[PDB]
Design a protein around this ligand. Structure first.
Ligand SMILES: CC1(C)C(/C=C/c2ccc(O[C@@H]3O[C@H](CO)[C@H](O)[C@H](O)[C@H]3O)cc2)=[N+](Cc2ccc(C(=O)O)cc2)c2ccccc21
Ligand SMILES: [Mg+2]
Ligand SMILES: [Mg+2]
Ligand code: NA
Ligand code: NA
Length: 1021
């Protein structure tokens, strides 16, 4: 009767932060209850841990009150069969909602809409007679979003909250021999939802693994593993605290053994009975075993050395009762004289924030995707990952233990959308709900070596509950620093100054919560802590402009120890069009309103894990080898802390304007933090015009667990000698002819002709035979299809006048019409020369003036000179160049300049000057929200079809006009236009990225000069 839905739902436990659970079992490190010690040692499956993943029955309801009572005792006929784990949104049952700060429900704590989508999962399953005769059978829900009641065989078992930590219940008294039925009622919204306002898709369901665990009545209930060292790390002590439940008997003993492969390194045995704690005695149900280990192999992300600990509960008889185990990493984390140290050395954090996202399965994680993420991270020189912003799938910490990544483990607490952010975290009545989110994380993950820093959550202001739970962790686990960014990044609840989007040089003095220059922040009076940015370099679309500025400062300042980029992967989701072709969706593409559109996509990699261009810029700046050149000696500095360069070659190549002359390879032998001098053999010194370039690459000859043989780890380029060309062009055998109309100036030379419209003032057509070459005239361009960083948070709903796109729009940059001031022809002895002069205006104010000269000579080459004035009081323009739409569509693009990948003025350090030859496809970057893209910088020669351009310019080349990109909201709606659109810019504004909601382009990358000059030569070859 009291099992009925009517009575259980009556209490409304999901609108009460004083009930976070009912009858839920205590939290602990991962268990498997092996009944054989060698299976435990080898980490092989345990027949005491069943998976209940697979096909369940599921049914959707608009509110829990709509669930019929029949559902408790038999399957609903309207129910479907569904795979678990899953998010029910990904099966089309209701919409996923993408909102950033604003809560997806009315803010009215602790209450929740009565429209509360409800997932009714059920499973019929068998249990062996063995499990019911002896011991304890429990069920483990690794992840239920956001709360749930549990029935088994019609009887109510319990209730659970916190979406990202395992909820476990005892099923012993509820199971029967043979057929049993689980009934799990999952609520999309709960009072827990008030602490789960992370900027991400809001989904729901049983989205992590479901398991049964069988333990004996007398059991290992908890164990903690600590490692302490002497000053030089030549000796360690492993302390293992083991706790038990059940009937204590004097014959009970515990053995803890430490292995390294098949070598047993130490072992101890003891009865239960701890040291004296206070005036009432000690813990009779606990024992600590202390093992000596001489010259331990130490854990780091550089070399992830692991031991294995095996904990046997047995009798004096030797009868094994059960065994648990974990991997062990010998490493020490401490902050000492203002620096974060690991094994006595200062870490430099090459970090990234990473969400649990999959474009098809939503927030369900798999081993394959996890491994793919880790490989991609290490291959791009990433040290560390921040679990933003919740405890991860348990397998993640095992994988980072083994592959070697430093992990920040973060409690599932974000209250961003409250006003102020403080509201719940400063309120004592919410302390219990918060403590369970902090304490149960620590109790689960404290034995993982890869976790080096605990975090109290994200974006919840600073309340007294943070201070309380900061001190809880410090008392319970001294071995790791605690950090938290809320309330100004330097509150009393953080051992590390952990700002988000603090800039390098520029102060943002917001009241109460300023973001100082990270350099100035360190020096403020009384401040002694290190500074590691919790989030930095917002990688939203065409971003990471200014990334090198950070890493220069990280390398110069000891107490700037890096940061975590925001963030790893685009949170795009897959939809299907009328033909079943997939496309990538973002905010509002599911009827979800209100939403925050494209802001779900901030990754360095697309959702399928293909890299954005910015990934290589990060790889370059975060490389572990630094290079200097004096003469033709190379100084290689290693930023590794623990390992020699014992899988590294240096390849070097010298080349003249792309043409290789000399190469060669040198073994690399640099000690950690050491230097190696390499003198290069006598290098070529040709008399040829052009520029000589030295390029070095570090190459790993052997495969790793994370990379292929031949993997490139770092690179650097220097200009050696230059030779300015002095030679006179070969004399031509003909002079071009000028034909003057009232309408046109036309120029002829051989089969070639050039037409200059005298009404417009632009080169409107060019001929080679009967084949015309332009579909659009060659005109000036002072605008770009705005990037995410240009737009910021501006919408048609609420315009943000301060963003770049809106200052451009307000000033008429986008609707300015060219007004010709001058267009004259002149014949001279060698060539014909057209001079032009245009003004761009808007409502009586002149924005730009453009003075040009076209010189067509007997060699068939058109020399263009441009001299642009920009009014001092108009917003600095996005670019200064020319555009046109060619008739040609060639397969290839050949250029000499920075490449091969997309690069922009404030993000070109990773690009190298060489001859690059790619398909036209690769000259467009398929950002899901389309914008300016594919620019290549510092180019001297561009080759497309019969055409060739020469000068010193930046260019993009595509089948997509700047008009189409600016007007199209999704990449999958783009259509190839007739021919090819070409933008050639003398100058181009930076892209920014320090954040994506305020102007972020540093002054030195703003086109502020007032007058500009660039020069081009158009020819056919
Ligand atoms: C913290 C800061 C800088 C902020 C807001 C910060 C923010 C915004 C969005 C965020 O979303 C996401 O969350 C994810 C975590 O779950 C990630 O962190 C990710 O990075 C983001 O996509 C996060 C922080 N503003 C906005 C603003 C608005 C306008 C102006 C202006 O024009 O003058 C200036 C400041 C203000 C305004 C006054 C004082 C302080 C701020
Ligand atoms: Mg509750
Ligand atoms: Mg947030
Ligand atoms: Na540093
Ligand atoms: Na975001």
């Amino acid at each position: 009767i009291t099992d009925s839905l009517a009575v259980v739902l009556q209490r409304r436990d999901w609108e009460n932060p004083g009930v976070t659970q009912l009858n839920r079992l205590a939290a602990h490190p991962p268990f498997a209850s092996w009944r054989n010690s060698e299976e435990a040692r080898t980490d092989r499956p345990s027949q005491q841990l069943r998976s209940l993943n697979g096909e369940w029955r599921f049914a959707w309801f608009p509110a829990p009150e709509a669930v019929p009572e029949s559902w408790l005792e038999c399957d609903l006929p309207e129910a479907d069969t569904v795979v678990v784990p899953s998010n029910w949104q990904m099966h089309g049952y209701d919409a996923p909602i993408y909102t950033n700060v604003t809560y997806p429900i009315t803010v009215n704590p602790p209450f929740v809409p009565t429209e509360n989508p409800t997932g009714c999962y059920s499973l019929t399953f068998n249990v062996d007679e063995s499990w019911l005769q002896e011991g304890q059978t429990r069920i483990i829900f690794d992840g239920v979003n956001s709360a749930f009641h549990l029935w088994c065989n019609g009887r109510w078992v319990g209730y659970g909250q916190d979406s990202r930590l395992p909820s476990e219940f005892d099923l012993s008294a509820f199971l029967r021999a043979g057929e049993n039925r689980l009934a799990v009622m999952v609520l999309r919204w709960s009072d827990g939802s008030y602490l789960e306002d992370q900027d991400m898709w809001r989904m729901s369901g049983i989205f992590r693994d479901v398991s049964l665990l069988h333990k004996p009545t007398t059991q290992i209930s908890d164990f903690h593993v600590a490692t302490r060292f002497n000053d030089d790390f030549s000796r360690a002590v492993l302390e293992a605290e083991v706790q038990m439940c059940g009937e204590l008997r004097d014959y009970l003993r515990v053995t803890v053994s430490l292995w390294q492969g098949e070598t047993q390194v130490a072992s101890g045995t003891a009865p239960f009975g701890g040291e004296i704690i206070d005036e009432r005695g000690g813990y009779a149900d606990r024992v600590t075993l202390r093992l000596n280990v001489e010259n331990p192999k130490l854990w780091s992300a550089e070399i992830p050395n692991l031991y294995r600990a095996v904990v046997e509960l047995h009798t004096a008889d030797g009868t094994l009762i059960e065994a648990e185990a974990c991997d062990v990493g010998f490493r020490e984390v401490r902050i000492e004289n203002g620096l974060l140290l690991l094994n006595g050395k200062p870490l430099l954090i090459r970090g990234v924030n990473r969400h649990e996202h999959h474009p098809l399965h939503g927030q369900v994680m798999d081993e394959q995707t996890m491994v793919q993420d880790i490989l991609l991270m290490k291959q791009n020189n990433f040290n560390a990952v921040r679990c933003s912003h919740y405890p991860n799938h348990p397998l993640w910490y095992t994988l980072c233990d083994r592959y070697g990544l430093y992990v920040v483990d973060e409690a599932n607490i974000e209250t961003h959308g409250m006003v102020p952010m403080n509201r719940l975290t400063d309120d004592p009545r919410w302390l219990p709900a918060m403590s369970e989110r902090v304490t149960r994380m620590v109790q689960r993950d404290r034995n993982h070596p890869s976790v080096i820093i605990w975090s109290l959550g994200n974006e919840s202001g600073h309340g007294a509950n943070h201070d309380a739970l900061y001190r809880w962790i410090k008392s319970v686990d001294p071995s790791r620093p605690v950090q938290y960014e809320g309330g100004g990044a330097d509150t009393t609840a953080t051992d590390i100054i952990c700002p988000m989007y603090a800039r390098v040089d520029e102060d943002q003095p917001f009241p109460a919560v300023p973001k100082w220059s990270i350099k100035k922040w360190l020096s403020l009076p009384g401040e002694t802590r290190p500074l590691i940015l919790c989030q930095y370099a917002h990688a939203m679309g065409n971003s990471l402009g200014g990334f090198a500025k950070y890493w220069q400062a990280f390398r110069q300042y000891p107490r700037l120890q890096g940061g975590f980029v925001w963030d790893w992967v685009d949170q795009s989701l897959i939809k299907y069009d009328e033909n079943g072709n997939p496309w990538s969706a973002y905010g509002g593409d599911f009827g979800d309103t209100p939403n925050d559109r494209q802001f779900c996509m901030n990754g360095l990699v697309f959702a399928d894990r293909t890299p954005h261009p910015a990934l290589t810029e990060a790889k370059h700046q975060q490389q572990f080898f630094q290079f200097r050149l004096s003469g033709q000696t190379i100084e290689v500095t290693s930023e590794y802390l623990f390992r020699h360069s014992d899988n590294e070659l240096l390849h070097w190549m010298v080349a003249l304007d792309g043409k290789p002359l000399a190469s060669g390879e040198v073994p690399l032998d640099v000690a950690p933090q050491g230097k190696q001098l390499i003198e290069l053999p006598e290098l070529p010194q040709p008399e040829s015009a052009g520029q000589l370039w030295l390029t070095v690459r570090v190459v790993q000859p052997n495969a790793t667990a994370w990379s292929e043989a031949g993997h490139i780890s770092a690179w650097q380029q220097w200009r050696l000698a230059e030779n300015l060309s002095v030679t006179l062009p070969a004399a031509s055998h003909a002079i071009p002819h000028l034909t003057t109309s009232e309408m046109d100036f036309c120029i002829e030379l051989g089969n070639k002709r050039w037409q200059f419209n005298r009404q417009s003032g632009f080169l409107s057509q060019m001929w080679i035979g009967d084949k015309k070459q332009l579909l659009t005239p060659l005109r000036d361009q002072f605008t770009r299809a705005p990037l995410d960083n240009d737009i910021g948070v501006s919408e048609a709903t609420r315009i943000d006048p301060n963003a770049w796109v809106e200052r451009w729009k307000a000033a008429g940059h986008y609707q300015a019409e060219a007004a010709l001031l001058q267009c004259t022809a002149d014949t001279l002895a060698d060539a014909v020369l057209i001079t032009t002069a245009h003004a761009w205006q808007h409502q009586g104010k002149t924005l730009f003036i453009s003075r040009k000269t076209y010189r067509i000579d007997g060699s068939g080459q058109m020399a263009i000179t441009v001299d642009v004035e920009v009014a001092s009081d108009t917003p600095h323009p996005a670019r200064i160049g020319l555009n046109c739409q060619l008739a040609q569509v060639a397969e290839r693009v050949n250029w000499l300049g920075l490449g091969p990948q997309e690069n922009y003025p404030d993000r070109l350090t990773a690009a190298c000057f060489d001859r690059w030859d790619l398909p036209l496809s690769d000259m467009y970057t398929p950002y899901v929200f389309p914008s300016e893209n594919g620019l290549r910088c510092g180019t001297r020669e561009l080759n497309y079809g019969p055409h060739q351009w020469r000068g010193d310019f930046q260019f993009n080349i595509s089948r997509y006009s700047q008009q189409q990109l600016m007007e199209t909201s999704h990449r999958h709606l783009l259509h190839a236009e007739e021919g090819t659109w070409l933008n050639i810019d003398g100058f181009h504004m930076g892209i920014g990225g320090d954040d994506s909601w305020s102007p972020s382009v540093s002054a030195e990358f703003q086109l502020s000069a007032g007058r500009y000059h660039y020069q081009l030569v158009w020819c056919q070859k």
